[model samples]
Target: ASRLYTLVLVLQPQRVLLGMKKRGFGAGRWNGFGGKVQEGETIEDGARRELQEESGLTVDALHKVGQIVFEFVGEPELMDVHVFCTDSIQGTPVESDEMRPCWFQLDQIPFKDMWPDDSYWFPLLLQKKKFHGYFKFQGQDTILDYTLREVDTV
Candidate 1:
């Protein structure tokens, strides 16, 4: 069975908000703020909660941009992640116990330090396109295979 997750991105003029995961699955990597979708919570609510918890930013309107499914070679659970984007938010991002929030110029995104699948779909996100992706990973650092496609609706 697969587990649900939410990944939110706060996009500004020419920048994006990303965080360095302090611990757990993506520790030491820069990525969007999110986590497992809790029981009884809507996916959008889960996205907002995780964003506020990890980065101290609250978003009222989130645009559904993409969905991704990640499968690791030996893992039983797949990560089904809903990706969101929003330019409107309240308050500046503050570091939390689980993450260190930071802003980066769009052109300077630290992709090398993020999950490998990011490089394939980030461009579509920036283009304001909706998409779906499936990524197969050999381990933490290698993407064995992936399929990404743009769509009219997410």
Candidate 2:
């Protein structure tokens, strides 16, 4: 069975905020803050919680920008990740025990230090568009197949 997850990114003019996870599944890669959706919590609630925990920032509203179903070639649980974006956000990005926060200029985003799946969908958010994406991974940095589409709504 696939487990549900949420990823929320804070975007600003020519900048994007990301976190370097200290440990866990995708540790060592730069990524938007997120994790498993807790029982009894809505997706938005989960996303907000993770955003606060990892980056010390909060958003009044988060727009769904993308959803990516990740199939790991030989793994058991699939990663059904929902992506959200927020430009109307507040608070300083502070490092947590789990993550180190940082801001990057849009053109300087460290894609090489991020998950292979991210590069596929991140651009859509930069364009201020909604999107849907799917990726198949053979390992930490390998994408065997993928799909992405811009949509009117997400």
Candidate 3:
């Protein structure tokens, strides 16, 4: 079985909000709202569950932006990352034990608190661009990379 993860980009005008998991290995890391795919759960179901579990928000619609596959040396898990973006959702956002929901303006994202590679592609993503990227990381350091074309329009 493959290990699947979902990252949700929830949008507001001034900034795109994302839920950050506050515990476990990636605690304090600014990632989209998501978790590991559970048995018998579809990617969409996993995404919805993660959003509600982490932020107490129910997503009404989610448009999958793209996906990226990564291989980590010496790691037991291979990651299949499914990325989704949504401007429309139901309910209000709140922080929970696993996450603290926050917003980052397009120009004011907290890159320092995020994984190093986020800064490279997030802007393009926020701009409604569609593309897929592959990255290899030795722990937190990016080692190799590839991109398949770029989309720049909304």
Candidate 4:
């Protein structure tokens, strides 16, 4: 079965907001803010909620950038994640128990500290292109196989 999830980036002209997942799913890696969609919220709503919860920032408008599906070799469930970007926001990024918020210049995104799939799609995002990606992982850090491509619609 496919489970819904959200991932968002607070994009500015020169930099982007990323959080260090202090604990849980993506612990130790610097990444965009997000988590699983809950029962009542739309995927976009979930993205906004997770972004606020993890980084203390509220975004009224989220720009849809991509969608990615992740599969784990031995796991039956698939993660259907919608990705977003926003140049506008309210409130400062304050660290939460779930994440340590930080900003990095566009040229200095720490790709090595993020999921392997990020490197492929980030360029698409930076170019303001929509994309879709699929990745199958044998383990946490090993990409068994993957494909990413720019699309007319995400």
Candidate 5:
């Protein structure tokens, strides 16, 4: 129930880049880039790989933003995801078969098409604050009850 995953945000001065997944898992959802950690790699490495593979961009460095535990009503499994962010990125983001890259103005985000929990702490991320989250879901769109805390560290 504790399999690990990672999600990376490419933070910028005016906008944040997100990807629209075109296939697999949460396909059709706009979200940060991430997937399962590979063998012999650190969580950060997996974050960087997922970002590059999904968006054709590379990050020189990343900072840990938070950790989130995701649970679904029908599944017995849970994902322990380490969330990472970077103001530092290299190369232009290009669309791949798996995702379509897009940017949202800091003031304008499309939370309606994203995973429901995103709205709760995505704003905190824009403010450059750290956080830790745990969400339990009744279905894909219904976030049952959750805990969100601002933290000094991940």
Candidate 6:
């Protein structure tokens, strides 16, 4: 079965921050807040649930910002990722067992702890542009295979 994940690039003053998972998959790495889509949950529901669970923030509005589809050789399933951007939210950010919530300035982000590809497209998303990406991974090395244009017209 395909696993679904949602990521939110939350906006804070002077920068765009995202809650990062401190453990599991890519531990101690900066990334978006997200988790697997549970049964009977819609994509938005999963996104909202993950956001609250990871960052203790209640998102008021989420705009579709991007998506990524990843497939690994020899793996039986694909990972479908949904990306969202939100500037309106409530509650204080907190660290969860799965993640540690932190705010970073756009230029001060810990890219060393994140997937290498984040530096390439995250900026565009911060600019209010939408994009679709396809990433292939060989262990920790990420290779971008294909990318579509930013959805500025639609």
- lDDT agreement with native, every candidate: 0.93, 0.88, 0.77, 0.92, 0.90, 0.79
Q: What does candidate 3's lDDT look like per residue over 1-154, in tens digits? A: 3488887888666788866767886787787888787889899999999888888888778887767666677777778888888887788889999888887787878888887667776876777777676667776656566454464421
Q: Over the stretch 1-154, how does candidate 6's per-residue lDDT look in tens digits?
A: 6678888888766776666666778776788888788999988889999889888889778888888777766677878898888887798888888888778887798877887778777877777888887777666665636455676532
Candidate 5: 10-residue stretch with minimal lDDT: 136-145
Question: Lowest summed-lDDT stretch of 10 residues in model 3?
Answer: 145-154
lDDT of 1 at 24: 92
Best by lDDT: 1
Worst 10 residues of 4 by lDDT: 51-60
Q: Pairing residues by index, what is the TM-score of model 1? A: 0.97
Off by over 4 Å in 3: 146-148, 151-154
RMSD per candidate (Å) reads 0.8, 1.2, 2.7, 0.8, 1.1, 2.0
Question: Residue-wise lDDT of candidate 1 within 44-108, one digit each (tens)?
Answer: 99999999999989877999999999999999999999999999889989999999998999999
lDDT of 1: 0.93
Q: What residue runs in model 2 are displaced by over 4 Å at the alpha carbon? A: none
TM per prediction: 0.97, 0.94, 0.88, 0.97, 0.95, 0.90
**What lDDT score goes with residue 86 in model 5?**
94
lDDT of 6 at 124: 73
What's the true lDDT of residue 74 in model 5?
78
Model 4, TM vs. native? 0.97
**What is the C-alpha lDDT profile of model 5 across 17-122, one tens digit per residue?**
9999999988989999999999999989889888989999997889898899998887887889999989978999999999999999977888888988999989
